[PDB]
Short mmCIF file of C-alpha atoms and ligand atoms in Angstrom, two decimals:
data_model
loop_
_atom_site.label_atom_id
_atom_site.label_comp_id
_atom_site.label_asym_id
_atom_site.label_seq_id
_atom_site.Cartn_x
_atom_site.Cartn_y
_atom_site.Cartn_z
CA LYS A 1 39.83 -200.61 -56.18
CA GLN A 2 40.70 -197.76 -53.70
CA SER A 3 37.08 -196.69 -54.65
CA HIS A 4 35.79 -199.47 -52.28
CA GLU A 5 37.58 -197.95 -49.20
CA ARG A 6 36.39 -194.45 -50.18
CA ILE A 7 32.71 -195.54 -50.05
CA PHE A 8 33.02 -197.43 -46.74
CA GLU A 9 34.77 -194.41 -45.15
CA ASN A 10 31.97 -192.11 -46.43
CA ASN A 11 29.35 -194.51 -45.03
CA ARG A 12 31.02 -194.42 -41.58
CA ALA A 13 31.26 -190.59 -41.65
CA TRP A 14 27.58 -190.36 -42.75
CA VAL A 15 26.55 -192.65 -39.85
CA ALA A 16 28.48 -190.42 -37.38
CA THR A 17 26.99 -187.16 -38.73
CA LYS A 18 23.50 -188.69 -38.80
CA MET A 19 23.89 -189.95 -35.20
CA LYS A 20 25.24 -186.53 -34.08
CA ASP A 21 22.68 -184.49 -36.08
CA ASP A 22 19.63 -186.70 -35.50
CA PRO A 23 19.35 -188.79 -32.29
CA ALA A 24 16.64 -191.33 -33.25
CA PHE A 25 17.06 -191.44 -37.06
CA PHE A 26 18.20 -195.12 -37.21
CA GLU A 27 15.66 -196.06 -34.51
CA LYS A 28 12.94 -194.35 -36.55
CA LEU A 29 14.25 -195.90 -39.80
CA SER A 30 14.38 -199.42 -38.20
CA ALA A 31 10.82 -198.82 -36.85
CA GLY A 32 8.14 -199.38 -39.51
CA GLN A 33 6.83 -196.33 -41.43
CA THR A 34 4.49 -197.09 -44.37
CA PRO A 35 5.33 -194.90 -47.41
CA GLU A 36 2.58 -192.59 -48.72
CA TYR A 37 4.11 -192.39 -52.20
CA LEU A 38 5.21 -194.55 -55.11
CA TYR A 39 7.71 -192.56 -57.23
CA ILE A 40 8.63 -193.84 -60.73
CA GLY A 41 11.62 -191.89 -62.06
CA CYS A 42 14.56 -192.20 -64.41
CA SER A 43 17.80 -194.09 -63.60
CA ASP A 44 19.85 -191.10 -65.08
CA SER A 45 18.01 -188.37 -63.06
CA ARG A 46 20.44 -186.61 -60.67
CA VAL A 47 18.65 -186.07 -57.26
CA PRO A 48 16.69 -188.59 -55.14
CA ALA A 49 12.88 -188.26 -54.90
CA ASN A 50 12.67 -187.62 -51.10
CA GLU A 51 15.18 -184.66 -51.39
CA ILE A 52 13.20 -182.97 -54.27
CA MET A 53 9.93 -183.59 -52.33
CA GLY A 54 11.35 -182.62 -48.88
CA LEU A 55 10.10 -185.94 -47.39
CA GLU A 56 12.12 -188.27 -45.11
CA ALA A 57 13.29 -191.36 -47.05
CA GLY A 58 10.98 -194.13 -45.77
CA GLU A 59 8.02 -192.03 -47.01
CA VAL A 60 8.75 -192.85 -50.76
CA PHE A 61 8.71 -196.38 -52.32
CA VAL A 62 10.98 -195.89 -55.40
CA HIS A 63 11.34 -197.43 -58.89
CA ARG A 64 13.87 -195.96 -61.34
CA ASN A 65 14.35 -197.29 -64.92
CA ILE A 66 15.66 -195.90 -68.28
CA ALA A 67 13.35 -193.00 -69.26
CA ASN A 68 10.80 -193.59 -66.42
CA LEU A 69 8.71 -196.07 -68.51
CA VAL A 70 5.68 -198.19 -67.56
CA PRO A 71 5.53 -200.71 -70.46
CA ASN A 72 2.45 -203.06 -70.62
CA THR A 73 4.34 -206.37 -70.35
CA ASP A 74 7.21 -205.33 -67.99
CA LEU A 75 6.80 -207.45 -64.82
CA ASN A 76 9.53 -205.37 -63.06
CA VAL A 77 7.45 -202.11 -63.04
CA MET A 78 4.05 -203.92 -62.84
CA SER A 79 5.18 -205.79 -59.68
CA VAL A 80 6.32 -202.41 -58.13
CA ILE A 81 2.83 -200.91 -58.85
CA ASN A 82 0.97 -204.02 -57.56
CA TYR A 83 3.06 -204.17 -54.33
CA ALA A 84 2.70 -200.37 -53.74
CA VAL A 85 -1.13 -200.51 -54.12
CA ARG A 86 -2.07 -203.95 -52.68
CA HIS A 87 0.68 -204.36 -49.98
CA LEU A 88 1.72 -200.76 -49.00
CA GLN A 89 -1.79 -199.14 -49.73
CA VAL A 90 0.08 -196.07 -51.10
CA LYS A 91 -2.24 -193.00 -51.60
CA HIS A 92 -0.17 -191.32 -54.37
CA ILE A 93 1.68 -192.63 -57.44
CA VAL A 94 3.99 -190.15 -59.21
CA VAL A 95 5.77 -190.57 -62.53
CA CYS A 96 8.55 -187.97 -62.62
CA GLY A 97 10.55 -187.22 -65.77
CA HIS A 98 13.44 -184.76 -66.08
CA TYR A 99 14.90 -182.54 -68.84
CA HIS A 100 18.46 -183.58 -70.13
CA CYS A 101 17.20 -187.24 -70.05
CA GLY A 102 19.83 -189.42 -71.77
CA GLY A 103 17.30 -192.31 -72.03
CA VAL A 104 14.82 -190.23 -74.11
CA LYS A 105 17.67 -188.71 -76.23
CA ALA A 106 19.12 -192.22 -76.96
CA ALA A 107 15.63 -193.36 -78.17
CA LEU A 108 15.63 -190.82 -81.06
CA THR A 109 19.10 -191.72 -82.50
CA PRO A 110 18.72 -194.21 -85.39
CA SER A 111 21.32 -196.77 -84.03
CA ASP A 112 20.69 -200.51 -83.40
CA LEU A 113 21.42 -200.60 -79.59
CA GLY A 114 20.71 -204.42 -79.56
CA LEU A 115 19.00 -205.24 -76.21
CA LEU A 116 18.12 -201.50 -75.58
CA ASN A 117 15.99 -201.23 -78.80
CA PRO A 118 12.77 -202.82 -77.46
CA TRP A 119 12.99 -200.76 -74.18
CA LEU A 120 13.48 -197.38 -75.99
CA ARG A 121 10.92 -198.42 -78.63
CA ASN A 122 8.35 -197.38 -75.93
CA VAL A 123 9.63 -193.74 -76.21
CA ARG A 124 9.49 -193.86 -80.06
CA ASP A 125 5.84 -195.06 -79.71
CA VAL A 126 5.11 -191.90 -77.57
CA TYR A 127 6.64 -189.82 -80.43
CA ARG A 128 4.36 -191.55 -83.04
CA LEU A 129 1.21 -191.14 -80.80
CA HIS A 130 1.99 -187.32 -80.82
CA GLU A 131 3.75 -186.95 -84.23
CA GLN A 132 1.82 -183.81 -85.40
CA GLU A 133 2.41 -181.98 -82.06
CA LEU A 134 6.15 -182.86 -81.99
CA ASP A 135 6.85 -182.22 -85.73
CA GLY A 136 5.24 -178.71 -85.35
CA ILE A 137 7.99 -177.76 -82.80
CA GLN A 138 10.92 -176.49 -84.94
CA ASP A 139 13.54 -175.96 -82.14
CA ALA A 140 15.27 -179.36 -81.42
CA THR A 141 15.60 -178.50 -77.66
CA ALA A 142 11.90 -177.49 -77.19
CA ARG A 143 10.85 -180.64 -79.17
CA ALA A 144 13.03 -182.84 -76.89
CA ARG A 145 11.54 -181.14 -73.78
CA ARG A 146 7.99 -181.75 -75.09
CA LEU A 147 8.87 -185.47 -75.77
CA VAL A 148 10.06 -185.86 -72.11
CA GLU A 149 6.66 -184.39 -70.96
CA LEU A 150 4.58 -186.62 -73.32
CA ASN A 151 6.63 -189.67 -72.18
CA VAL A 152 5.67 -188.86 -68.51
CA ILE A 153 2.00 -188.42 -69.53
CA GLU A 154 1.92 -191.81 -71.35
CA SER A 155 3.74 -193.54 -68.39
CA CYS A 156 1.00 -192.04 -66.09
CA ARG A 157 -1.75 -193.34 -68.44
CA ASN A 158 -0.11 -196.82 -68.23
CA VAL A 159 -0.20 -196.71 -64.38
CA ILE A 160 -3.92 -195.74 -64.46
CA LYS A 161 -4.58 -198.72 -66.84
CA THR A 162 -3.27 -201.26 -64.22
CA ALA A 163 -6.05 -203.40 -62.62
CA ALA A 164 -4.38 -202.64 -59.21
CA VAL A 165 -4.98 -198.86 -59.49
CA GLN A 166 -8.45 -199.16 -61.12
CA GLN A 167 -9.80 -201.71 -58.56
CA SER A 168 -8.26 -199.88 -55.55
CA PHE A 169 -9.56 -196.47 -56.78
CA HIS A 170 -13.10 -197.93 -57.38
CA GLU A 171 -13.29 -199.71 -53.97
CA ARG A 172 -11.39 -197.19 -51.75
CA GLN A 173 -10.89 -193.85 -53.66
CA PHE A 174 -7.01 -194.15 -53.72
CA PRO A 175 -4.41 -194.00 -55.08
CA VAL A 176 -4.34 -190.95 -57.43
CA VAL A 177 -1.66 -190.66 -60.15
CA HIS A 178 0.33 -187.46 -61.01
CA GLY A 179 2.94 -186.71 -63.71
CA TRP A 180 5.78 -184.33 -62.78
CA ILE A 181 8.84 -182.91 -64.53
CA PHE A 182 11.97 -182.16 -62.46
CA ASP A 183 14.06 -179.29 -63.89
CA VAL A 184 17.79 -179.50 -62.93
CA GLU A 185 18.38 -175.88 -64.06
CA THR A 186 16.11 -174.55 -61.25
CA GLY A 187 15.49 -177.62 -59.04
CA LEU A 188 11.70 -177.03 -59.30
CA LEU A 189 9.01 -179.68 -59.80
CA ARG A 190 6.35 -178.80 -62.43
CA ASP A 191 2.98 -180.62 -62.48
CA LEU A 192 1.85 -181.84 -65.97
CA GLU A 193 -1.81 -181.84 -64.75
CA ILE A 194 -2.68 -185.32 -66.02
CA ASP A 195 -6.46 -185.28 -65.37
CA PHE A 196 -6.59 -188.56 -63.30
CA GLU A 197 -10.45 -188.77 -63.08
CA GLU A 198 -10.91 -187.85 -66.80
CA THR A 199 -8.14 -190.35 -67.87
CA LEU A 200 -9.57 -193.09 -65.58
CA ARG A 201 -13.07 -192.65 -67.19
CA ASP A 202 -11.48 -192.43 -70.73
CA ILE A 203 -9.78 -195.86 -70.10
CA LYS A 204 -12.86 -197.59 -68.51
CA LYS A 205 -14.91 -196.79 -71.72
CA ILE A 206 -14.00 -200.25 -73.20
CA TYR A 207 -16.35 -202.67 -71.31
CA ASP B 1 -15.43 -191.96 -59.05
CA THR B 2 -14.38 -188.48 -57.64
CA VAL B 3 -10.90 -187.74 -56.14
CA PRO B 4 -11.17 -187.04 -52.37
CA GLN B 5 -10.06 -183.42 -51.60
CA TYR B 6 -7.45 -184.62 -49.00
CA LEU B 7 -5.49 -186.25 -51.94
CA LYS B 8 -5.40 -182.80 -53.70
CA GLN B 9 -4.06 -181.06 -50.51
CA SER B 10 -1.07 -183.53 -50.34
CA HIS B 11 -0.06 -182.27 -53.84
CA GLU B 12 0.35 -178.60 -52.70
CA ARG B 13 2.25 -179.72 -49.53
CA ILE B 14 4.90 -181.43 -51.82
CA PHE B 15 5.30 -178.39 -54.16
CA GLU B 16 5.74 -176.05 -51.09
CA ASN B 17 8.44 -178.47 -49.69
CA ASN B 18 10.13 -178.41 -53.12
CA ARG B 19 10.16 -174.53 -53.21
CA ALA B 20 11.56 -174.35 -49.62
CA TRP B 21 14.24 -176.95 -50.64
CA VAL B 22 15.18 -174.85 -53.76
CA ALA B 23 15.37 -171.64 -51.55
CA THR B 24 17.80 -173.38 -49.08
CA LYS B 25 20.13 -174.63 -51.90
CA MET B 26 20.25 -171.10 -53.50
CA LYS B 27 21.22 -169.69 -49.99
CA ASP B 28 24.23 -172.16 -49.78
CA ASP B 29 25.33 -171.64 -53.46
CA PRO B 30 23.62 -169.19 -55.92
CA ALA B 31 24.86 -171.44 -58.85
CA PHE B 32 24.17 -174.92 -57.24
CA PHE B 33 21.66 -175.95 -60.00
CA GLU B 34 23.88 -174.35 -62.73
CA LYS B 35 26.77 -176.62 -61.49
CA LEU B 36 24.52 -179.71 -60.93
CA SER B 37 23.13 -179.50 -64.56
CA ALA B 38 26.72 -179.29 -66.02
CA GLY B 39 28.05 -182.34 -64.06
CA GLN B 40 29.79 -185.33 -65.75
CA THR B 41 28.66 -189.01 -66.24
CA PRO B 42 28.14 -191.25 -63.17
CA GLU B 43 30.85 -193.80 -62.31
CA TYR B 44 28.56 -196.18 -60.39
CA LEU B 45 25.55 -198.33 -61.30
CA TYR B 46 23.58 -199.06 -58.13
CA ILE B 47 20.93 -201.81 -58.10
CA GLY B 48 18.86 -201.72 -54.93
CA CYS B 49 15.50 -202.55 -53.43
CA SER B 50 12.41 -200.30 -53.90
CA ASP B 51 11.50 -200.72 -50.15
CA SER B 52 15.03 -199.79 -48.90
CA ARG B 53 14.75 -196.60 -46.80
CA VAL B 54 17.84 -194.46 -47.72
CA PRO B 55 18.95 -193.45 -51.22
CA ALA B 56 22.24 -194.86 -52.60
CA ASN B 57 24.18 -191.55 -52.86
CA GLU B 58 23.38 -190.70 -49.15
CA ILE B 59 24.51 -194.21 -47.85
CA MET B 60 27.66 -193.90 -50.04
CA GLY B 61 28.27 -190.15 -49.29
CA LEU B 62 28.41 -189.31 -53.04
CA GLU B 63 26.76 -186.32 -54.79
CA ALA B 64 23.67 -187.54 -56.71
CA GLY B 65 24.73 -187.28 -60.39
CA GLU B 66 27.56 -189.74 -59.57
CA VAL B 67 25.15 -192.80 -59.24
CA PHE B 68 22.98 -194.27 -62.06
CA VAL B 69 20.23 -196.08 -60.07
CA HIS B 70 17.83 -199.03 -60.54
CA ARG B 71 15.50 -200.04 -57.68
CA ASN B 72 13.02 -202.96 -57.86
CA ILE B 73 11.26 -205.36 -55.39
CA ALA B 74 14.06 -207.33 -53.60
CA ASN B 75 16.96 -205.94 -55.75
CA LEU B 76 16.63 -208.70 -58.41
CA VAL B 77 18.38 -209.23 -61.74
CA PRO B 78 16.14 -211.90 -63.40
CA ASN B 79 17.50 -213.43 -66.70
CA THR B 80 14.64 -212.32 -68.99
CA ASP B 81 13.78 -208.92 -67.36
CA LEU B 82 14.40 -206.30 -70.08
CA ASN B 83 13.91 -203.48 -67.49
CA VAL B 84 17.07 -204.41 -65.46
CA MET B 85 19.02 -205.81 -68.48
CA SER B 86 18.54 -202.47 -70.34
CA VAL B 87 19.80 -200.57 -67.18
CA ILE B 88 22.97 -202.82 -67.12
CA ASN B 89 23.56 -202.46 -70.91
CA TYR B 90 23.07 -198.64 -70.84
CA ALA B 91 25.33 -198.27 -67.75
CA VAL B 92 28.17 -200.31 -69.34
CA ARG B 93 27.92 -199.41 -73.07
CA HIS B 94 26.64 -195.76 -72.85
CA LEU B 95 27.90 -194.48 -69.42
CA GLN B 96 31.14 -196.63 -69.27
CA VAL B 97 30.45 -197.10 -65.49
CA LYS B 98 33.52 -198.46 -63.51
CA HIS B 99 31.48 -200.07 -60.65
CA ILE B 100 28.22 -202.04 -60.45
CA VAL B 101 26.82 -202.52 -56.94
CA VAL B 102 23.89 -204.75 -55.98
CA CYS B 103 22.82 -203.57 -52.51
CA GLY B 104 20.33 -205.53 -50.37
CA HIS B 105 19.09 -204.57 -46.91
CA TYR B 106 17.81 -206.40 -43.79
CA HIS B 107 14.03 -205.88 -43.02
CA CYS B 108 13.39 -206.28 -46.79
CA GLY B 109 9.60 -206.45 -47.31
CA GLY B 110 10.24 -207.93 -50.79
CA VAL B 111 12.22 -210.95 -49.50
CA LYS B 112 9.75 -211.38 -46.54
CA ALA B 113 6.74 -211.36 -48.96
CA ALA B 114 8.48 -214.08 -51.10
CA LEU B 115 8.31 -216.60 -48.16
CA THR B 116 4.63 -215.89 -47.15
CA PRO B 117 2.22 -218.38 -48.76
CA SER B 118 -0.22 -215.69 -50.01
CA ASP B 119 -1.15 -215.63 -53.74
CA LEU B 120 0.15 -212.21 -54.82
CA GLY B 121 -1.22 -212.59 -58.36
CA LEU B 122 1.14 -210.63 -60.65
CA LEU B 123 3.80 -210.45 -57.84
CA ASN B 124 4.19 -214.27 -57.68
CA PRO B 125 6.45 -214.57 -60.78
CA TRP B 126 8.68 -211.65 -59.62
CA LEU B 127 9.09 -213.09 -56.05
CA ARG B 128 9.62 -216.62 -57.53
CA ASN B 129 13.24 -215.48 -58.26
CA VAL B 130 13.79 -215.09 -54.44
CA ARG B 131 12.24 -218.56 -53.87
CA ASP B 132 14.70 -219.92 -56.50
CA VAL B 133 17.59 -218.49 -54.39
CA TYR B 134 16.24 -220.39 -51.34
CA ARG B 135 16.08 -223.67 -53.39
CA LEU B 136 19.70 -223.15 -54.65
CA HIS B 137 20.80 -222.99 -50.92
CA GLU B 138 18.09 -225.20 -49.29
CA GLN B 139 20.34 -227.34 -47.01
CA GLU B 140 22.26 -224.21 -45.76
CA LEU B 141 19.01 -222.28 -45.04
CA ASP B 142 17.05 -225.27 -43.55
CA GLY B 143 19.99 -225.84 -41.09
CA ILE B 144 19.64 -222.23 -39.68
CA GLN B 145 17.15 -222.63 -36.79
CA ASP B 146 16.51 -218.94 -35.83
CA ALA B 147 13.90 -217.50 -38.34
CA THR B 148 15.59 -214.02 -38.23
CA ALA B 149 19.13 -215.40 -38.95
CA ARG B 150 17.69 -217.58 -41.80
CA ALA B 151 15.92 -214.51 -43.31
CA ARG B 152 19.16 -212.44 -43.01
CA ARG B 153 21.10 -215.25 -44.76
CA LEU B 154 18.43 -215.32 -47.56
CA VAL B 155 18.87 -211.51 -48.08
CA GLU B 156 22.68 -212.06 -48.44
CA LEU B 157 22.34 -215.02 -50.87
CA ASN B 158 19.77 -213.00 -52.92
CA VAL B 159 22.41 -210.19 -53.34
CA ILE B 160 25.06 -212.79 -54.31
CA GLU B 161 22.73 -214.33 -56.96
CA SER B 162 21.78 -210.85 -58.33
CA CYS B 163 25.58 -210.19 -58.65
CA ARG B 164 26.10 -213.55 -60.47
CA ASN B 165 23.28 -212.53 -62.89
CA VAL B 166 25.03 -209.18 -63.63
CA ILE B 167 28.36 -210.94 -64.28
CA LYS B 168 26.56 -213.30 -66.79
CA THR B 169 25.62 -210.32 -69.06
CA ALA B 170 27.56 -210.02 -72.38
CA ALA B 171 27.92 -206.24 -71.68
CA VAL B 172 29.87 -206.81 -68.39
CA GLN B 173 32.00 -209.72 -69.76
CA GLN B 174 32.99 -207.83 -73.00
CA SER B 175 33.73 -204.53 -71.15
CA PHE B 176 35.75 -206.35 -68.44
CA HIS B 177 37.81 -208.21 -71.14
CA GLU B 178 38.55 -204.96 -73.11
CA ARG B 179 39.06 -202.43 -70.23
CA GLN B 180 39.15 -204.32 -66.84
CA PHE B 181 35.88 -202.58 -65.73
CA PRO B 182 33.27 -202.62 -64.47
CA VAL B 183 33.72 -204.76 -61.36
CA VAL B 184 30.62 -206.03 -59.53
CA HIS B 185 30.15 -205.77 -55.73
CA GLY B 186 27.45 -207.17 -53.42
CA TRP B 187 26.65 -204.96 -50.37
CA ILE B 188 24.13 -205.22 -47.52
CA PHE B 189 22.77 -202.04 -45.85
CA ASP B 190 21.82 -202.49 -42.15
CA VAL B 191 19.11 -199.91 -41.21
CA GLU B 192 19.66 -200.73 -37.44
CA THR B 193 23.21 -199.17 -37.62
CA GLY B 194 23.36 -197.32 -40.98
CA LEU B 195 26.45 -199.39 -41.92
CA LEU B 196 27.27 -200.96 -45.32
CA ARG B 197 28.84 -204.49 -45.23
CA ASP B 198 30.77 -205.87 -48.27
CA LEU B 199 29.74 -209.52 -49.10
CA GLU B 200 33.17 -209.80 -50.89
CA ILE B 201 31.75 -211.53 -54.01
CA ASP B 202 35.09 -212.55 -55.75
CA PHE B 203 34.29 -211.05 -59.17
CA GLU B 204 37.24 -212.75 -61.03
CA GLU B 205 36.46 -216.24 -59.55
CA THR B 206 32.68 -215.84 -60.35
CA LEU B 207 33.52 -214.53 -63.87
CA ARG B 208 35.70 -217.67 -64.55
CA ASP B 209 33.05 -220.00 -62.90
CA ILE B 210 30.37 -218.60 -65.34
CA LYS B 211 32.57 -218.75 -68.52
CA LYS B 212 33.23 -222.52 -67.90
CA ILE B 213 30.23 -223.94 -69.88
CA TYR B 214 31.22 -221.98 -73.09
ZN1 ZN C 1 16.49 -189.77 -67.69
ZN1 ZN C 2 13.72 -204.55 -49.78
#
């Protein structure tokens, strides 16, 4: 309960430092700046997107969920993507995963987690789509790291499959989609080099 | 359909920024990332809006690592949304979080978009939850004459209803019975001033109010 007071005191100190360090920060923040990026990341990742990316917050529209998923029938993430593309006219969409991801780890443990099961089932489906690759990695840690990367790649594919991204990219040549991995050990972003154009053509084949 | 070269240049700009940022943090503390990647479980679940302009841990002056975060359009907790319900269940049953905060903000594009008559296609069902909050409080909101004050009141009521939806979850009710945590708070962030306001939700009263029907 003392926790409440602690946060409000920190907020006041942060406002004072921000006013002293940056004169027009609140004025700029209260002024409208349209974000250039949609970032989809994990709820249990440890550093905010704009810090990692060295952007000012206001430049990144953010969605975070367990294990940075983009499931087909999830209106929560689909409404984020639709708003970002059709309302904000964002030029970049990023899916960013991270190593030491509790969401991805939890997905592999054979427990019935009731309500969590259908969410984490999406990660187990990534595992089955890439079973030969993953089963050929003998070290548990390296296998887990590869699963986090494949999960990002499949989340990226799911973004590219949205009608919002396909229609916008056809009519206007944006946005592009990237998959990244954030490594807490070094703080460095690594690009997974999802081939957007190749993936977009691969997906448009049907029709 | 070829990717314009200017979209490729933006990529390299971000990776440079990230390298510079890593250099800075290694200056301050050679073992910053070594420490960061050993840190313990977060004590707070923060539910906020996607179009809010400052991250939770900054607003709250916490180290990131201390806040498990969900952000969505208009900081909603809809009954049948497995995305947010799985965040709440994981936070309570896996992370044993002590606090859940729903934080709204004034100048919320999500809440604004909910009141504009446009057909948003796929967005209409998501923003329908905000329209439901307006219907639940129609006489209050229709009696506020200034458009800006009405919109601000809608943002506050939206946070309060998101909080009610958290307190309805079996995870929160069972944990609170067994261990007297987590507690749920509704906050508003005011970008004009940088200040948090507590909406003072009355967790225990709301928890009783909800348990009545059963
Ligand atoms: Zn994670
Ligand atoms: Zn908002």
